[PDB]
Each structure stands twice: as structure tokens, then as C-alpha cells.
Amino acid sequence: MSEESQAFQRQLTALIGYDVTDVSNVHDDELEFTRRGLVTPRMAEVASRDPKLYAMHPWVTSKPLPEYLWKKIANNCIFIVIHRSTTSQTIKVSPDDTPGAILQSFFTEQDFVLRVCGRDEYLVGETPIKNFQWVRHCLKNGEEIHVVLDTPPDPALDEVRKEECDRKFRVKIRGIDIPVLPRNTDLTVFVEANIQHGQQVLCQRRTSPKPFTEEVLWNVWLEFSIKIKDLPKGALLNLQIYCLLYYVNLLLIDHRFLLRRGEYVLHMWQISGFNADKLTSATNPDKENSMSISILLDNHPIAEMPNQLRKQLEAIIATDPLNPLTAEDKELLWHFRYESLKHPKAYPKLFSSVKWGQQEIVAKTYQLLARREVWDQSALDVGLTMQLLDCNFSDENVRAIAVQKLESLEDDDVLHYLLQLVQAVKFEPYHDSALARFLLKRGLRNKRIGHFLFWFLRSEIAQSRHYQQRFAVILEAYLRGCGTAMLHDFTQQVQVIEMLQKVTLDIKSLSAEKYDVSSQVISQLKQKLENLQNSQLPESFRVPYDPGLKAGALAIEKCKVMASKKKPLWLEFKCADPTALSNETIGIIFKHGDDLRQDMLILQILRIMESIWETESLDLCLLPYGCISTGDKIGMIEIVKDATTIAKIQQSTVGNTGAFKDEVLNHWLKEKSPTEEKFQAAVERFVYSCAGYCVATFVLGIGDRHNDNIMITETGNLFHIDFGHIERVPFVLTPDFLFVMGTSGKKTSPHFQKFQDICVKAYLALRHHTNLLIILFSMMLMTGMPQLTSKEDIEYIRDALTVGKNEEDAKKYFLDQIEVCRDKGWTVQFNWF
Numbered sequence: 001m002s003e004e005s006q007a008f009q010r011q012l013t014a015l016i017g018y019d020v021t022d023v024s025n026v027h028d029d030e031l032e033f034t035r036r037g038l039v040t041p042r043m044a045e046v047a048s049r050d051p052k053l054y055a056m057h058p059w060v061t062s063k064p065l066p067e068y069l070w071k072k073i074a075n076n077c078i079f080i081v082i083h084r085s086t087t088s089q090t091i092k093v094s095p096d097d098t099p100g101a102i103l104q105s106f107f108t109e110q111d112f113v114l115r116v117c118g119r120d121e122y123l124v125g126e127t128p129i130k131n132f133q134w135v136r137h138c139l140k141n142g143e144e145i146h147v148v149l150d151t152p153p154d155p156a157l158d159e160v161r162k163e164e165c166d167r168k169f170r171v172k173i174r175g176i177d178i179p180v181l182p183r184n185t186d187l188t189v190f191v192e193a194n195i196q197h198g199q200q201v202l203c204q205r206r207t208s209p210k211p212f213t214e215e216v217l218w219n220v221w222l223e224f225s226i227k228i229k230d231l232p233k234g235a236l237l238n239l240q241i242y243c244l245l246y247y248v249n250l251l252l253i254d255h256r257f258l259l260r261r262g263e264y265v266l267h268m269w270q271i272s273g274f275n276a277d278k279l280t281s282a283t284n285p286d287k288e289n290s291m292s293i294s295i296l297l298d299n300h301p302i303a304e305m306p307n308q309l310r311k312q313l314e315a316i317i318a319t320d321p322l323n324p325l326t327a328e329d330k331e332l333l334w335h336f337r338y339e340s341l342k343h344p345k346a347y348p349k350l351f352s353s354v355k356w357g358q359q360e361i362v363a364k365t366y367q368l369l370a371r372r373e374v375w376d377q378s379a380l381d382v383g384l385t386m387q388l389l390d391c392n393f394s395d396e397n398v399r400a401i402a403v404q405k406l407e408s409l410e411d412d413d414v415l416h417y418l419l420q421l422v423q424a425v426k427f428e429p430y431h432d433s434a435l436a437r438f439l440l441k442r443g444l445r446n447k448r449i450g451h452f453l454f455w456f457l458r459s460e461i462a463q464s465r466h467y468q469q470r471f472a473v474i475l476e477a478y479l480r481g482c483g484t485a486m487l488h489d490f491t492q493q494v495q496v497i498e499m500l501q502k503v504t505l506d507i508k509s510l511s512a513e514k515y516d517v518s519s520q521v522i523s524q525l526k527q528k529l530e531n532l533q534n535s536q537l538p539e540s541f542r543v544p545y546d547p548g549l550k551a552g553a554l555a556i557e558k559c560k561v562m563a564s565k566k567k568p569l570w571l572e573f574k575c576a577d578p579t580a581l582s583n584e585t586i587g588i589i590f591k592h593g594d595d596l597r598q599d600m601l602i603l604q605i606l607r608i609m610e611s612i613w614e615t616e617s618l619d620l621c622l623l624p625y626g627c628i629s630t631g632d633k634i635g636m637i638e639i640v641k642d643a644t645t646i647a648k649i650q651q652s653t654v655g656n657t658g659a660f661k662d663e664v665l666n667h668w669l670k671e672k673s674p675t676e677e678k679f680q681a682a683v684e685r686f687v688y689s690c691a692g693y694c695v696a697t698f699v700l701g702i703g704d705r706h707n708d709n710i711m712i713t714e715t716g717n718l719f720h721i722d723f724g725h726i727e728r729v730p731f732v733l734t735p736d737f738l739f740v741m742g743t744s745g746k747k748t749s750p751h752f753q754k755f756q757d758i759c760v761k762a763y764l765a766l767r768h769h770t771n772l773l774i775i776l777f778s779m780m781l782m783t784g785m786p787q788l789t790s791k792e793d794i795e796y797i798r799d800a801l802t803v804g805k806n807e808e809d810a811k812k813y814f815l816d817q818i819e820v821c822r823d824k825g826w827t828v829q830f831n832w833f
């Protein structure tokens with residue numbers, strides 16, 4: 001390690017938001033072992049990736065072009081405008097034509113490429129132009145394909161700098177210690193020790209209740225019922241203090257297959273006034289305020305059916321993820337495990353029927369896994385694959401076969417599930433995992449995947465003491481292979497977000513909440529912003545939620561502090577790309593304090609719902625705008641241009657006090673349209689966007705909102721916002737919306753009938769991916785939201801998608817829900833006083 005291999009680690013630390021060489025919060029060397037274990041996968045992907053295709057990161061998809069985009073192509077004829085310097089000429093191209101093919105038909109000096117104007121997006125590679133996402137983007141929104149002809153970026157810029165016993169298990173509980181304990185009166189306290197494995201407690205022992213003081217000693221040997229050999233890899237020694245106050249975990253089998261042995265002083269997590277933070281093997285960094293517990297360990301290892309029963313098994317196999325397996329169910333699944341293995345959909349249930357507390361069985365289970373023919377050959381089922389990666393599975397072998405199926409995902413799809421896959425790292429017993437390496441692998445192989453991997457990881461590192469260490473080692477592994485070029489981009493990005501966040505917080509503190517703003521405030525803002533720009537704001541930076549865009553200089557005149565109780569910064573940038581065809585600013589809202597992780601997840605689920613609707617050839621017109629969570633209750637938002645709140649459109653009127661009126665939405669659309677045809681396209685867009693947001697919002701159970709949290713574009717696109725919070729209504733189908741549909745209380749119409757028809761199609765279309773939706777929702781709650789009910793809410797999703805009903809009831813169930821919105825009118829809306 002030279003002197004210029006040390007000022008590098010300082011650079012990595014500031015890019016991560018955490019120091020991965022800090023060994024202050026460890027009781028073993030797993031984190032360091034994982035840093036070294038990741039060197040091989042890092043260099044293995046860095047060495048097998050094509051410098052040229054990696055430098056341009058073509059965004060492609062292998063899915064068939066949807067019907068709704070085909071009808072936009074009446075001809076077979078796609079137009080592509082090309083520019084040099086000033087002038088330009090248009091060309092008629094076949095949807096099947098390659099970048100190479102279109103190139104030869106333009107010439108009709110052979111090393112030029114097609115970049116998108118204003119963007120860092122490239123139409124390169126041996127793929128039909130119809131198979132480029134940018135092209136597909138243009139076709140939908142009625143935009144025109146514009147490209148500039150320039151030279152491929154130098155792959156040298158991506159260069160990477162060089163590198164270099166039948167005994168029963170027992171634990172002695174020495175005691176628990178805490179510097180300060182007060183509140184109130186005086187209770188009794190005991191230590192609870194669980195032996196866990198995939199949310200299955202295998203055995204459980206308590207101590208005797210002792211008076212609660214700042215030091216409580218026991219010196220007690222807890223002898224469990226599970227033999228040492230019967231301990232499975234990944235099993236956790238879960239220690240908890242009740243009066244439930246504190247918890248902390250200790251992997252019983254370490255990362256070297258060694259039985260944990262010796263003395264340990266663990267600082268515990270407190271419970272804040274079920275959730276994935278309770279599974280972490282990390283100890284509390286805060287050594288001066290946290291409860292600690294002292295233990296001792298001294299005890300290497302892993303060294304044909306009657307028709308009626310089949311019907312039962314099939315019934316079992318047929319149930320939803322959330323349907324609890326009975327003792328009866330589990331014994332049946334196990335006993336018929338070779339038959340159960342022929343059904344990929346039974347795997348989660350089958351591996352949950354396994355008694356992991358017994359060696360002979362785990363072994364038989366591993367035998368089961370070596371005869372993995374059906375699973376290997378099955379088509380990739382993301383939902384099936386995600387279930388095996390949640391909190392219910394700690395066996396690395398079971399989990400490895402899910403990550404196996406993930407290997408066959410193309411980058412398009414990896415981008416779809418990147419966020420929840422990154423969150424899925426929390427369910428891994430160990431820091432080094434096939435899932436972790438997968439992320440690392442795909443992230444180094446593709447710049448777009450790498451870019452988002454960076455922010456998703458950096459997001460968690462900034463606001464999760466429970467999992468920041470693990471994520472920090474992983475991010476470091478990525479940053480040591482992404483290349484000098486992106487190391488520079490990220491640097492630029494991190495520089496800018498941190499500076500603006502100081503400014504966002506310094507402005508919020510200056511102004512008292514409610515009055516509002518507030519003139520000095522607007523002046524000081526422009527001043528801080530003047531200070532940052534000369535100097536030094538990075539001259540240009542990638543928009544984190546849209547790596548293609550490079551924001552440039554601020555437009556300080558358009559920048560302001562918004563009129564909300566939380567003082568969000570409204571920032572506007574100039575596009576740093578000169579070749580851009582538009583003169584629009586890049587709009588960004590910087591805001592504390594919403595928990596924008598909830599917004600990130602929800603939004604991503606929305607994007608998943610779109611891809612689901614794309615499979616059935618549907619377009620419900622969603623606007624899953626850009627949103628990155630950057631720290632604790634703080635992040636950035638994309639500003640959708642010319643969009644207003646529904647509530648702002650009602651208060652175009654004198655009355656105030658939420659005296660809402662029915663006709664306005666349709667007028668607002670009429671003013672904002674130049675022609676009447678565009679108005680008609682806005683009405684149509686509204687009917688689709690409203691239908692889409694009614695269905696998804698109902699499924700996710702975030703359908704009951706105030707019209708301050710629902711927005712519409714001047715182009716007629718409806719969409720929800722502000723998810724990071726959250727009599728009764730299914731969703732928002734307010735009378736003002738219906739009026740745009742040509743109804744107002746108890747009537748119907750050719751646009752409303754359309755609305756009702758599209759919802760049911762959309763609704764039934766999501767139910768074909770029920771399992772995937774359930775598992776994502778369930779995961780979202782565990783890793784993204786405040787401590788919840790590891791029953792009830794997940795249970796609400798079951799009901800919403802009407803699990804176990806025929807398609808007919810569901811169509812009506814949803815039609816009933818539309819009517820509940822009609823029967824309530826403004827009631828719920830008016831209440832949102």
C-alpha cells in the first residue's frame with residue numbers, strides 16, 4: 001500500500017459516508033474477511049467486461065414491443081433525426097434496423113456512434129432500434145427521436161487502478177450493563193436467549209428475574225435442548241432484555257464454519273417507541289449509552305400418492321405466500337418431498353417445512369437440492385425467487401438457488417428489482433453472500449445498474465446503523481471496480497448533494513414554521529446559492545435519479561424556498577449538455593424531513609406495476625417520478641414540469657376552508673390546452689392515469705389521500721405524491737374527477753365506462769402476479785417502514801387482491817369500490833380538514 005493508495009481510501013470513505021477500515025465496532029473479522037472475499041468477484045467482472053460496451057452502457061430490452069406502441073407505428077416506419085454542428089437530416093428507419101444498419105444508410109470514418117441529444121445515452125450495440133428503451137420512451141409520449149453523431153468515449157477513462165459433539169449447546173450469561181437507566185419507577189428485568197433460524201426459534205431459555213440496576217450480574221449457564229451438531233449454519237443467538245427493552249444478535253456459526261467460542265461484550269439495540277433491523281448481526285456503535293450484555297461460550301462442524309392426499313398437497317402448494325403452514329401441512333410437504341420438488345411453486349413452502357434444528361434432516365434437505373433438475377429448467381419466476389430471499393430463509397444453500405435464478409435476469413429487469421434486491425441483503429445471515437456478490441457483479445458490468453446500486457447502498461449506509469457496515473463493505477467493493485471515470489462522477493454528485501443539504505437545513509432552521517416565507521429567507525437562499533456557484537459547485541453533475549442528465553449551473557433566479565411547513569428547497573439547473581435540443585431547466589426539490597425511503601420503495605413498486613401491465617399490453621399512464629433518499633429524513637425529488645396539485649386547482653376560488661367545487665378540473669384542462677384535440681388527449685390521458693393510480697393505490701393500501709397529495713400535469717396526466725407518511729375511502733375518485741369523465745353523482749358515460757373497464761383489466765392483470773406483489777409488499781414493510789404488524793397489514797394486501805376468489809367476484813369487488821367513492825363524494829376529502 002503506497003502513499004497514493006491511502007489517499008484513495010480517504011476518497012472511498014467520503015464517497016460511502018462511512019469508514020470501512022474502522023474496526024471499533026467489531027467482535028470478529030467478518031467485515032474484513034468480506035472485503036477480501038469480494039476482491040475476486042470484483043476483479044472477475046472488471047476483467048470480463050467489454051470496455052467499449054461498458055463505456056456507453058446501451059439501455060436495451062429483449063421484450064417484444066407492446067401493442068400500444070405498435071399502433072403508434074402505423075407504417076413499419078420509424079423516423080430518426082440526426083444532427084451535426086447546426087443542420088440535420090431526418091431518416092425513415094425499420095423498427096428492426098440495427099445501429100450499424102442505420103449508420104450504413106446515412107453514409108449511403110466508420111467509427112462513429114449515435115448519442116441522444118442532451119443526454120449521455122447511446123444507441124449502440126447489435127440490437128434492433130426498437131429494442132432500445134430510449135426509443136420506446138419517445139414513441140409513447142409522442143416525442144421525436146433526435147440523435148447527435150460524435151465519437152465513442154475513451155474506454156481508457158474507465159481504467160481501474162491496480163490492487164492487492166453431542167453435547168447440548170449452552171451459553172453463560174455473565175450479566176447486563178448500562179451507564180444510565182432512569183425513567184420513572186423501579187421494575188424487574190431478565191435476559192431471554194433464543195436460538196433462531198429464519199424466524200423459527202429452535203429453542204428458548206430465560207434467566208431468573210433480578211432487580212433492575214445499572215449492573216445486573218447472573219453468572220448463569222443456560223443449557224439449551226439442541227445438540228451442538230444439530231446447530232445449522234446461519235443460526236443466530238438472539239439475546240433480549242425484558243421488564244422488551246433491548247436486543248442483540250450473534251451468529252453461532254461464524255463465516256469460517258467455526259462454532260462461536262469465547263468471551264463477548266455486546267452492545268445492544270434499544271426498541272423505539274416484525275422489521276428487518278431486529279435480525280442484524282451488528283452491534284450498537286454507541287458504546288457510551290447503550291445497554292451491553294456479557295456472555296461466555298465454550299463448547300469445527302458441518303464436518304406414488306393416493307389421489308386424495310395429492311389433492312391436499314396441491315391445495316397446500318396453491319396457497320399464497322402469507323398462508324401459514326400447519327404442523328399437518330408441514331409434515332405432508334416433507335414426507336412427499338420428492339414429489340414436492342417437481343413444483344417450483346412449492347419450494348418456499350417445502351423449505352419452510354424443513355426441521356433445520358436437526359442435522360440428518362438438513363443433510364437430507366441438501367440431498368434434495370442436488371437433484372435440482374425442475375428448478376434449474378423452470379422459467380425465471382421473480383416472485384418465487386424473491387420469497388426464497390426474505391427473512392424466512394437463513395440457509396445459504398436454499399437462498400443460493402434463488403440467486404441462481406436471478407443470474408438469468410437481463411439488465412432491464414435487474415434495474416426493475418435492484419432496490420428491493422439491495423434491501424434483500426438485510427435478510428442475509430452473513431456479510432458475504434451470493435446475493436451480495438450478484439449485486440456487486442451486475443453493478444460493475446453495467447454503469448446504469450452501478451449508478452443506482454451506489455445510491456441505494458449509500459442511502460442505507462447514511463440512515464441505518466443496523467446495516468451500514470455491511471453495505472459499506474459492499475459499496476467499497478463496487479467503487480474499487482466501477483472505474484476512475486465513475487469514481488469521478490459519483491465524487492461530483494456527492495459533493496453537490498451534501499452542499500445543498502447544508503443549505504436546505506440551514507434555510508429550514510432560519511425560518512420559523514408557519515408564518516411561511518418570508519423575504520430575508522428568500523434573499524439569504526439566493527446568497528448561499530451564489531456562494532456555492534463561484535465557488536465551488538462541481539461544474540456539472542449527473543442527476544442521481546436520471547444518470548443520463550448532466551445538470552450544470554444553477555439558475556439562481558428560479559431557485560426558491562417552498563411555502564410548506566418543512567421548507568423544501570426548489571432548485572433549477574441548466575442542462576450542462578450544449579447539444580440538448582431544449583431550453584428547459586432541470587428541476588429539483590431538496591427536502592427534509594419526510595422519510596423519502598418510503599417514497600423510493602413505493603415509486604419503484606409503481607414501476608414494477610407498469611412492467612406488469614406492459615406484459616398484458618396495458619398502459620395506465622403512471623408518473624413514477626424520480627426520488628432519491630440520501631440520508632435520514634432527507635433527499636431529492638424530480639420536479640415534474642407544469643404539474644399542479646388538485647387542491648391548488650380548487651383553490652383558484654375565493655372561498656377557502658376547503659369548500660370544494662365539482663366543475664373546476666375540467667375547466668383547468670380547458671385553459672391549459674391550446675387546441676381542443678390536445679384537450680381530448682388530456683381527457684383520455686386523465687382517464688388512464690386516474691385508472692392506474694386508483695388500482696395501484698388501492699392494492700398498496702395508500703388510496704385514501706388529501707388532494708394536496710394528488711397532482712395532474714397540464715397535459716392531463718394524474719399522479720400521486722408524498723408517500724413518505726402513511727370513515728374511509730378505497731381511493732380518490734372525487735366528483736371533480738368524474739366530471740372530467742362526464743358524470744356528476746349517479747350517472748354514467750362513454751369515458752367513465754372506459755375508466756371502469758380499464759380498472760378491472762388492470763386489476764385482474766396485477767392479480768396474475770399476486771405472489772410477487774405480496775412478497776414485495778411484505779418485504780417493503782419489513783425493510784422500509786416503522787415497526788409494524790408481522791401479520792395485519794400484509795393481511796390487508798391478501799384481501800385487496802382478493803386472493804382465492806374467481807375472476808368474476810374480483811371484477812365486482814373492485815366495481816363496488818368505485819361505487820364507495822361515488823357514495824362518499826367529498827366527505828372524506830372535506831374531512832381532510
Ligand SMILES: CC(C)(O)Cn1cc(-c2ccc3c(c2)OCCc2sc(-c4ncnn4CC(F)(F)F)nc2-3)cn1
Pocket residue numbers: 562564568587589591594625637638639640641642643644711721722723
Ligand atoms: C415546474 C413548474 C414551474 O412548471 C410548475 N410547478 C411544479 C411544481 C411541483 C411541486 C411539487 C412537485 C412537483 C412539481 O413535481 C412532481 C413530483 C413531486 S413529489 C413532491 C413531494 N413529495 C413529498 N413532498 N412533496 C411536495 C414538496 F416537495 F413540496 F414537499 N412534490 C412534487 C410546482 N409548480
